[model samples]
Target: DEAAELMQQVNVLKLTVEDLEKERDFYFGKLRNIELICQENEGENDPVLQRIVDILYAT
Candidate 1:
């Protein structure tokens, strides 16, 4: 009945959140690598790269 339908919706939401978490982790790792590269390569002077690095920091 209504309870069963609500349970199904909750399960779907759980799976969606799990997928989103995986995606977030992947992107966070990539961002960390980009930040490390910027630090090592002195990318701060490069306007585009610096802006990207700044955005990452702001996040």
Candidate 2:
């Protein structure tokens, strides 16, 4: 019974961890797609494109 208590906690923890990972990847792909779209914005030599780089590149 004592060891089984830890099992329930770990099971719940694993489910929560899986959800968190999926959420992270979903947002990761979303922002990266947005970043690429901004990659070609107006031109590559202007403040807009460079500003976009600032937010999603090293940010």
Candidate 3:
């Protein structure tokens, strides 16, 4: 019974990891794309943009 419960938990964890990993990558890519555009525009040295960029890569 203990092993069965642990195995079930592991299965659920596996699915959660798969879902979140893909979601995280998708959003990170989008953020990086926006950052690219910002870098090329007038926001590169803007203080507000710098703060946003710091937050985006703070992980």
Candidate 4:
């Protein structure tokens, strides 16, 4: 019974990890899109835009 309970806990954690991985990938894709926009308009001299670019690059 103890072993069965431990196995169930492991399964729950595995599913949680898989879900988090999917969330991570989704955010990564969104960040990539933002990076592309920054790259395309890198010539802009706005301080806010520059800060965004800098932070994105730092990550």
Candidate 3 regions off by >4 Å?
Answer: 43-59
Candidate 4 minimal-lDDT segment of 10 residues: 40-49
- Model 4 per-residue lDDT at 48: 80
Best by TM-score: 4
What's the residue-level lDDT of 47 in candidate 3? 81
For residues 1-59, could you state the per-residue lDDT of candidate 1 as single tens digits? 99999999999999999999999999999999998888886834877778777898893
User: What is the lDDT for 53 in model 1?
Assistant: 74
lDDT of 4 by residue, 1-59 (tens): 99999999999999999999999999989989998887888767767878888887783
Give TM per candidate.
0.77, 0.75, 0.70, 0.82
Q: Would you give me the overall lDDT of model 4?
A: 0.88
TM-score of 4: 0.82
Tell me how far the alpha carbon of residue 26 in candidate 2 is from the true structure, in angstroms, after superposition. 0.6
Distance from true location, Cα of 11 in model 1, Å: 0.8
Ten contiguous residues with the weakest lDDT in model 2: 39-48
lDDT of each: 0.88, 0.85, 0.85, 0.88
